[model samples]
Target: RTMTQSLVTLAEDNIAFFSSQGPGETAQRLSGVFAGVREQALGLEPALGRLLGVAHLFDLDPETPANGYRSLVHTARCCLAHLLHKSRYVASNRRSIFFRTSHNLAELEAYLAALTQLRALVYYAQRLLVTNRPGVLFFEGDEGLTADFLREYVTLHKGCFYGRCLGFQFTPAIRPFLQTISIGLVSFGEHYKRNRFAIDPELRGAEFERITQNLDVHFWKAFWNITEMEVLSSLANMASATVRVSRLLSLPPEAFEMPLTADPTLTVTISPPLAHTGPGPVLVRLISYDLREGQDSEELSSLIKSQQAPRSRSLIVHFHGGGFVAQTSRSHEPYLKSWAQELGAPIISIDYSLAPEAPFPRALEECFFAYCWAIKHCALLGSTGERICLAGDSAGGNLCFTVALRAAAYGVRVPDGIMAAYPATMLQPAASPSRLLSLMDPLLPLSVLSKCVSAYAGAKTAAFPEGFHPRRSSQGATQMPLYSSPIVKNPFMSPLLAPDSMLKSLPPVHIVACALDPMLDDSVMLARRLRNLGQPVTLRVVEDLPHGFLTLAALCRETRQAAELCVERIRLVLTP
Candidate 1:
């Protein structure tokens, strides 16, 4: 009880200091103090009469030898130690820290102490989770009654807020304080409000709270991407015992592990296998494939050899999507093999040229050339028949359909069907109902779309090209022009804008749309136009899905299902 009095005084002084600063900072400072206390506690000498008592506090302290002060004090010290560890972790600048924070035993210790009456530790964890950060981990920790209790308490609150701050982005310096404010507010029972909430306050206040309450388990599941809430919910369900064991033993989860969704989908985790013995095809490696001149080239050659068919089969010509600036076909080769084996289709994924460096025409030329090459060398791609199916998501979809239009103009034989999921068709962000729909796109925004288009067009382009000029010209304009804009009179460039006559003549098509995607309208509009032209079309709308879901199937069930469904459609179309 006397210690309680001391703690109260300490809390009051700390509270004042923390009030001026933040919970994250205060916790960091407290960790140092606890470290000093632990050093002194561990160094204490016991009475001479007690056997090995010199190292035991119970043996030396006469003030309540049986009362367990040492047990209580040491436990509190342990709690402090855990808090310090977690605080230091949060302070780390690397993204790995954010990822490892959850399910890591050391990180949960502080929270566990607080839950089990380790007063200081509980206070520290609360400040870190609820007050200092908005999307920090809420559930998951060490295995014990304390850990369970804290997990339950956090579940009950969903999340807390110390301040009703208004800002879209957060900085490291303010994060600790923000976490404290968030928890403090939630602890006080005002986690989210109607009128004051950012979007649709009245509709969101009660609705959001109820939704997230059932989502604790999912929150933990998605504890990695603060941008994602599904993982948070999963974390809620993960066995605390499992988490503790993994953390204590220093067992790291799969470094490149992707989340498993309920749907069956393929994730392209490797680069394409492209072998050039000499003046063969120009070898291009881009994005995160980590390719080097010789070392990477050998790996790439081996990759190509593994996938290359000894005989002819159907073709799975591929194009990777990266907003016309990022990513590479080489990066997607590993995943392509799945389709090649499962569907028995020869794969030809392309490393298309990117913007500013390649500009609009350059990127288009690269894709057109890759596709045309596959067409010319159908035997090399292992095609028994000339059955070709075009596929891509997001920007890749734009490239796919655009390339098809070019094929039509150039008298190139059209592929069987095209699979475009959550395709990015609109190059311009003109305000309209369709544009408004894009504003809520889960992954990207209008500004992003605008920037990507600008980068692809290059400053040299005379004017923004109109209606998919890159799709029409097979070469990019040197400057901005109406044809390059995709929104202008050229229907081939903006396939969405092409008249019914053109839409009806294209090969059979499959378009998959995600519920939460900004480009959902584009799919719908494209589907409608295709059907109106009496062209065979397969339209599937995936529910509870986000933008670019097919490419990101590892994140959610809806997206994965969408991907499988799209692939299956492609197979069927090619078959018929």
Candidate 2:
């Protein structure tokens, strides 16, 4: 919520730099501005780099100091847009695109179409900024990127693709529509191109006008008086307290649960019932246990031990999802139990210690210990050496993949499959290119992820390596993998970045990504790499599902289907 002094200065400099330059001439000072921006951009996690770069390309550079000495305005505007608009997309969506993104369901189509137009406008505007031209332009030789860019750009035929229908009401959800459109991403040059006169009636102008008017109409409609603010203020204060506890304690963003009404849909066993035994190969169960908060390590171990009764076979180790902090079994246990039964195998879902307090590898090591314990006691846990698997959801998923990478580095038994639901495997900034795509998604965005990255990174000021913090500090080159992201070049850290040799060593994988989840690209990209390596990989993209939707949905259709799909994958692969 507060501005860093450095960012503030940068904003000030940007405003001045733009003001001193006139149309059709390169401002020598502007080059320094660009250099500063690029340094800042590259300094961020790849995701955040895209966010900062896009913001600079659209919002910052076009402003003239003549507009009320605009540095302060620029900073505030960009900061709000970055934090409130873009970052929310990435964070709320948990950095995955598996869910539906628009809040304006009824107008979703029009909104998406507007977004496409807006993006083109922004791209063209950016080009206009660079070349001061109004016609179509091409980038030479950068063919692949150019083609992909053009394809995505031209294919966005307003309301096609991502725009699903919501009911018509012109309701409160329209605010988000306006918020996204008003981001000014593709329309920054409206006034500029018009030379401060009436801008042309382009798609940019029409959409912008509609959105601004819609926002104005909704703001008053949604406005509450002082008494309402008091009640809201009380709730807001409580929420702040909760957030402090959650953040300091490393908890999930929320703790909302509903009842599960389905029949006993899943079960776990050490051995398949003899009735199911046959010449068909034995099926190995992939299981995980998610413990509740305040439940001590011993309690969690006991729960896992209880599940490992009477000799188990084939397993997938797991940890629960809770931002590495607060929520306990109350949050993750039910899901774990369900997974255990559905997978028909034993699971060892570790309840790692909380973060900020147990930052970095402590929680990870606990997870590693659980994984190691599973390996050492595989016979007791029902695992065949060939069929052992590993997985987690959210932060737990992050642990699953991170542990896998660490295991790969140590030449440990790699998982036969990895299932990460809303996995936060990479700890870099949330601005990965696909992550920046949250600009269109209504829920999560880049700014939300910046807060998350800052929180996770905390205050450990060190001249770290390339894969750690991704700092631009003049450090010598290291042959770390790019996909490793913010630390360690091993494939386990970034399964997406694993080279062919490393990928071949990985077990076949099944990844479930929600449509609106920012991590959708991560899964897709990783799957592509796995396929490239001739490793068996299956990706089931969940449509109309949101980040953390499965756990959130209890036993709803979307959740049930997603879980069932995973079960089916395990069944199919483990089948003789």
- Least accurate 10 contiguous residues by lDDT in model 1: 243-252
lDDT leader? 1
Cα lDDT over the full model 2: 0.40
* Clashes in predicted model 2: 60
Worst lDDT run of 10 residues, candidate 2, spans: 241-250
How high is the lDDT of residue 240 in model 2? Answer: 19
Residue-level lDDT of model 1, residues 265-340, one tens digit each, is 5321211212121112333322111111232233333423212224444566667776666655433433343354
Candidate 1: clashing residue pairs, number: 70
- Model 1 residue runs over 4 Å out of place are 1-310, 437-442, 459-489, 499-501
- Model 2: per-residue lDDT, tens digit, 1-576? 133234333444544544455442333433443343334323322333333454444321242111111211232233223323432343345334354433322232243233323333333323322432211111223334433443332222223112332211112334444344334322432433354212321233333323221221112212111113446434423211111111101111111221111323432112211222221111122233322232223422333221123333465565666555444323443445555555655554455654545545454554554455455444444454446766656656656666766555554546656766656644442222334233334333233333333334433321122332211212222221112134433444344544566545565566666644556545545544555557776666654444555443343555566655655555443442
TM-scores of the candidates in the order shown = 0.45, 0.45
